[PDB]
Amino acid sequence: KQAPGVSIITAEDIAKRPPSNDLSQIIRTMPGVNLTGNSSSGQRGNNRQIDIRGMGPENTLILVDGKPVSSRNSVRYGWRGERDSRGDTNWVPADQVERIEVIRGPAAARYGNGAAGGVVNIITKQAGAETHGNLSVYSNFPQHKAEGASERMSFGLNGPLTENLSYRVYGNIAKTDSDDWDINAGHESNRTGKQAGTLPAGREGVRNKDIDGLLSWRLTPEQTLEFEAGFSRQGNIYTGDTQNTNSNNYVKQMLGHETNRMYRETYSVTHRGEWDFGSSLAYLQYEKTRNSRINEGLAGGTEGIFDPNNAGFYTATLRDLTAHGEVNLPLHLGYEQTLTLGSEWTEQKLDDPSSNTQNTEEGGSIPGLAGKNRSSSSSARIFSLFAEDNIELMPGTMLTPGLRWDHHDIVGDNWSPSLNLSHALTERVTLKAGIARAYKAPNLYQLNPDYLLYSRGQGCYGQSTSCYLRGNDGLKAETSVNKELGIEYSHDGLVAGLTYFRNDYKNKIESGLSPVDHASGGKGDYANAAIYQWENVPKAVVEGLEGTLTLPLADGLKWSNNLTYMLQSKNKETGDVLSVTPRYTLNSMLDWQATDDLSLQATVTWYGKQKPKKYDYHGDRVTGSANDQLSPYAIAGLGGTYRLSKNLSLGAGVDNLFDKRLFRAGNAQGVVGIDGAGAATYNEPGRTFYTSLTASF
Ligand SMILES: O=C(NCCCC[C@H](NC(=O)c1cccc(O)c1O)C(=O)O)c1cccc(O)c1O
Ligand SMILES: [Fe+3]
C-alpha cells in the first residue's frame, strides 16, 4: 500500500473510511498529499483540491482508468490562481472504485503535462468471468444542522454476454447539502462600510448524477477492444460564496439554488493487445465539459461575484480530445530489462463567452486589444513522444531512465528527462532515489492576450492606481526538477519508511509584478491604467518529508500511520508562500479484525499549524487579523463494518468524534470594508454520524 513516492488506496480502504461524497477525502490522507487551494489568496477557500508535495492542485493530474480528466480547465482561472471549481475527484462514485493510485514526484514526470506534483489515477471495478453487481447506500448525519448532510446511492452490474464479449455499467445519485448561508456568522472577519453585513460562506452543496457504460470485446485470443461512454452532471447548491466575500442582491436571491452546473460527457475507445514481443495499448477519449453558470464580473471586487447588470446563465464549453499509443518490449540484452515506447496527442478547445468580456472604458484602451466582442475561442495542442527503459541491474535493483518530449503548438518544445532508482540494500530494506524535470503547459487563460482583468488599484502590485492584467502568449511552460531520496524497511507487515523530497520550481506562472505598459484614456483618476501580464517567476521551491509506519500489533490488529511534513514553500522572487498547507499531517488508523465477520476502525488525523501569506496584492506587509494563524488540531473517528453474509454488509461510524470545528472567516487579506481572515479560510465539519449498506453478488 505504501512505498517511497507511491501509494495505493484499495476498495477495502474506501469501505473502512467512507467519504461523504468526493474522493479527495480519502485521497488526501496519503503521505505527501494535502487538500488545499492553488495559491495563497484564500479565495474560493472551501473549494480545496488535492495537492501533491505542496506543488498546488493544478499540478496534480487526475486520471480515470488511465485517461485524463480536464474538466476543471473549463472554469475561469482568476487573478490569484484559483478557479471556482470543486476539482475533478468527484466524477466517479466512491463505491464503484476498485483502486486509487497516487504517484508523486520524479516517478510521475513521465505522465507529462500537469504532473509536476504527481498523478492520481482512479480505477474502476471491472467485470469478471461471471456476472456480478452491487447496490450501495451511504447517508450521514451532522450533529450541527447548519452543516450539510450527504446521501449517496450507487449501483454496479458487470458480466459476459458472449464468450469474448463483456460489459460493465454503474450509476450514481448523490446529494451533499450546502452549509447554511449563515454558518460562519459570529466567525467572520470584521466588516464595515459598504461591506458591513457580508458573510464568508460555508461549503457549497453538490448534486451528482453519474452513469457509465463499458463494452469490452475480445476479438482474438490476444486482442481486446473496449468502448465506453460516460454521462455525469454536478449542479451546486449555492450558499453565498463569492471570490472576495462581498455581496449584492443577486447573491442573496440565489441562496439555495443552482448557480453552476457542470455536465461532463466522455466517450472512449481502447484497444489493448497481448502478443509475443510484449504488449500494446492505445485509446481515443473525447471529453466534453459544459460549464453553465451565472455570469460573474471580472474587475476588482467584482471579480467572481454574480453580475446583476448582465444576469442569467452563460455556458463555457471544453472539448478535450485525447489519443495515446504505447508498446512494451522485454529485452534480454545481458540485463533483463523492459522497454516502453509511446506517442500522445491531445487537443483542448475552449469556448468561453463571459471570461473575455472585460472592457477598457474605465482604465483606457490597450493597443492590440479590442474592448468589445473579443473572441470566445482558445485552444492548444500538445504532441508527445516518450520511451522508458526499466532496467534490472541485479536482483533487487532497477534503474529506470526515460525521456519525454512534448511539442506545444504555441509554447514550443519541451524536454522532460527522468531517472528512477530502487535498491535492495537488504531483503528488508530498500533505498529509492529519483530526479526528473516535470512539465506544466500554461492554461488557456494564462496564455490568452484576449483575457483581461481590471482593478481600480486595490489589486495592483506595487501601486494604488488602476491596472489591467492580461494573458500572454509569449509565456514559457513551468518546469520543475523534482528530486526525492527515500528509505524503507519492510518485512512481515512491519513497514517503516521516510522520504525527503525537493522540487525546484522554474517559471511558475503567476500574475505579474511590474507594468509592461500603460493604457490610454478612460475615466478620471482611473484613466491610463497600468498593464501587467501573466509572467513566469524565475525560481520557487518546495521541500519536505513523507513518512509511513505500519506495526502489526497482533494477528487481528494493525496500526498504520502516514506522515507529511512540509519544510518549505517559497516563491523565491517575492518570498511569500506558494500554497498554504499544514506544517505536518499525521493520519493514524487502528484496524481490528474483531471477528471473521466484524471489523472495527479507529482513526486520528493531526494537523499542524497553518500560516497565511505575508504580503497583500500590493506587495505590502499585511496587518491585524490578516496574520491570524490556525493552531494545530486533531480529528478522530470510529467506524465499523458488520458483514451479515457474502451478499450483505452494513457500515456505521462517527467522523470527528470530539467535534473539533472550524469556520471560514474570509480571505487571507484585508480589502476596503473586509478585514482579512489569514489562514482561517475553510470550514471544518463537526461530528457526523454515518450509516451504510452494501448488497452484492
Ligand atoms: O474585494 C475587493 N474590494 C472590496 C470590494 C469592492 C466591491 C465593489 N468593487 C467594484 O465595484 C469595483 C469596480 C471596478 C473596479 C474595482 O477595482 C472595483 O472594486 C465596490 O466598489 O464596492 C477587491 C479585491 C481585489 C481587487 C480589487 O480591486 C478589489 O476592489
Ligand atoms: Fe477594486
Side-chain angles (χ1 to χ4, degrees), residues 215 316 380 396 399 430 456 481 572 619:
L215 291 192
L399 208 29
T430 296
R456 273 167 186 158
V481 181
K572 268 213 186 182

PDB file of all heavy atoms in Angstrom, residues 215 316 380 396 399 430 456 481 572 619:
ATOM      1  N   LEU A 215     -18.470  -1.626 -22.872  1.00  0.00           N
ATOM      2  CA  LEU A 215     -18.426  -2.966 -23.505  1.00  0.00           C
ATOM      3  C   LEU A 215     -16.969  -3.328 -23.815  1.00  0.00           C
ATOM      4  O   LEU A 215     -16.278  -2.574 -24.494  1.00  0.00           O
ATOM      5  CB  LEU A 215     -19.221  -3.013 -24.816  1.00  0.00           C
ATOM      6  CG  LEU A 215     -20.747  -2.908 -24.788  1.00  0.00           C
ATOM      7  CD1 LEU A 215     -21.303  -3.279 -26.156  1.00  0.00           C
ATOM      8  CD2 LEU A 215     -21.367  -3.790 -23.718  1.00  0.00           C
ATOM      9  N   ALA A 316     -19.781  27.779 -20.740  1.00  0.00           N
ATOM     10  CA  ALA A 316     -18.439  27.555 -21.274  1.00  0.00           C
ATOM     11  C   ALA A 316     -18.367  26.128 -21.718  1.00  0.00           C
ATOM     12  O   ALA A 316     -18.967  25.242 -21.096  1.00  0.00           O
ATOM     13  CB  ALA A 316     -17.402  27.824 -20.217  1.00  0.00           C
ATOM     14  N   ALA A 380      -5.222  24.703 -27.544  1.00  0.00           N
ATOM     15  CA  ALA A 380      -3.845  24.330 -27.543  1.00  0.00           C
ATOM     16  C   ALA A 380      -3.761  22.862 -27.876  1.00  0.00           C
ATOM     17  O   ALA A 380      -4.661  22.077 -27.615  1.00  0.00           O
ATOM     18  CB  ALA A 380      -3.241  24.616 -26.187  1.00  0.00           C
ATOM     19  N   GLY A 396      16.961  -7.296  -7.184  1.00  0.00           N
ATOM     20  CA  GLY A 396      16.705  -6.290  -6.146  1.00  0.00           C
ATOM     21  C   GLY A 396      16.818  -4.836  -6.599  1.00  0.00           C
ATOM     22  O   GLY A 396      16.305  -3.928  -5.931  1.00  0.00           O
ATOM     23  N   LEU A 399      17.084   0.306 -12.392  1.00  0.00           N
ATOM     24  CA  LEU A 399      17.340   1.644 -12.898  1.00  0.00           C
ATOM     25  C   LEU A 399      16.393   1.938 -14.080  1.00  0.00           C
ATOM     26  O   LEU A 399      16.280   1.128 -15.013  1.00  0.00           O
ATOM     27  CB  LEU A 399      18.803   1.752 -13.338  1.00  0.00           C
ATOM     28  CG  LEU A 399      19.495   3.120 -13.279  1.00  0.00           C
ATOM     29  CD1 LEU A 399      18.918   4.000 -12.182  1.00  0.00           C
ATOM     30  CD2 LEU A 399      20.998   2.953 -13.086  1.00  0.00           C
ATOM     31  N   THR A 430      15.098  -1.106   1.414  1.00  0.00           N
ATOM     32  CA  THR A 430      15.170  -0.639   0.054  1.00  0.00           C
ATOM     33  C   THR A 430      15.426   0.854   0.074  1.00  0.00           C
ATOM     34  O   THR A 430      14.773   1.600   0.801  1.00  0.00           O
ATOM     35  CB  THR A 430      13.838  -0.846  -0.684  1.00  0.00           C
ATOM     36  OG1 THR A 430      13.539  -2.241  -0.784  1.00  0.00           O
ATOM     37  CG2 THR A 430      13.909  -0.264  -2.065  1.00  0.00           C
ATOM     38  N   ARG A 456      -9.199  48.856  -9.949  1.00  0.00           N
ATOM     39  CA  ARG A 456      -9.060  50.286  -9.675  1.00  0.00           C
ATOM     40  C   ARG A 456      -7.788  50.622  -8.891  1.00  0.00           C
ATOM     41  O   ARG A 456      -7.402  51.758  -8.790  1.00  0.00           O
ATOM     42  CB  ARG A 456     -10.288  50.789  -8.892  1.00  0.00           C
ATOM     43  CG  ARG A 456     -11.427  51.214  -9.799  1.00  0.00           C
ATOM     44  CD  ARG A 456     -12.774  51.426  -9.106  1.00  0.00           C
ATOM     45  NE  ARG A 456     -13.813  51.698 -10.119  1.00  0.00           N
ATOM     46  CZ  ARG A 456     -15.131  51.532  -9.959  1.00  0.00           C
ATOM     47  NH1 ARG A 456     -15.654  51.111  -8.818  1.00  0.00           N
ATOM     48  NH2 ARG A 456     -15.933  51.777 -10.968  1.00  0.00           N
ATOM     49  N   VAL A 481      12.362  20.565 -11.367  1.00  0.00           N
ATOM     50  CA  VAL A 481      13.248  19.460 -11.121  1.00  0.00           C
ATOM     51  C   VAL A 481      12.906  18.809  -9.773  1.00  0.00           C
ATOM     52  O   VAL A 481      13.396  19.213  -8.687  1.00  0.00           O
ATOM     53  CB  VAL A 481      14.741  19.847 -11.225  1.00  0.00           C
ATOM     54  CG1 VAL A 481      15.633  18.634 -10.972  1.00  0.00           C
ATOM     55  CG2 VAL A 481      15.036  20.433 -12.598  1.00  0.00           C
ATOM     56  N   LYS A 572      10.484  32.508  -4.709  1.00  0.00           N
ATOM     57  CA  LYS A 572      11.821  32.988  -4.336  1.00  0.00           C
ATOM     58  C   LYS A 572      12.045  34.408  -4.813  1.00  0.00           C
ATOM     59  O   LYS A 572      12.960  35.077  -4.379  1.00  0.00           O
ATOM     60  CB  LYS A 572      12.909  32.064  -4.898  1.00  0.00           C
ATOM     61  CG  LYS A 572      13.379  30.931  -3.973  1.00  0.00           C
ATOM     62  CD  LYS A 572      14.864  30.639  -4.211  1.00  0.00           C
ATOM     63  CE  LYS A 572      15.375  29.429  -3.449  1.00  0.00           C
ATOM     64  NZ  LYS A 572      16.833  29.261  -3.703  1.00  0.00           N
ATOM     65  N   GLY A 619       1.942  43.940  -2.714  1.00  0.00           N
ATOM     66  CA  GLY A 619       3.301  43.580  -2.307  1.00  0.00           C
ATOM     67  C   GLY A 619       3.636  44.073  -0.908  1.00  0.00           C
ATOM     68  O   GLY A 619       4.742  43.842  -0.419  1.00  0.00           O
TER      69      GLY A 619
END
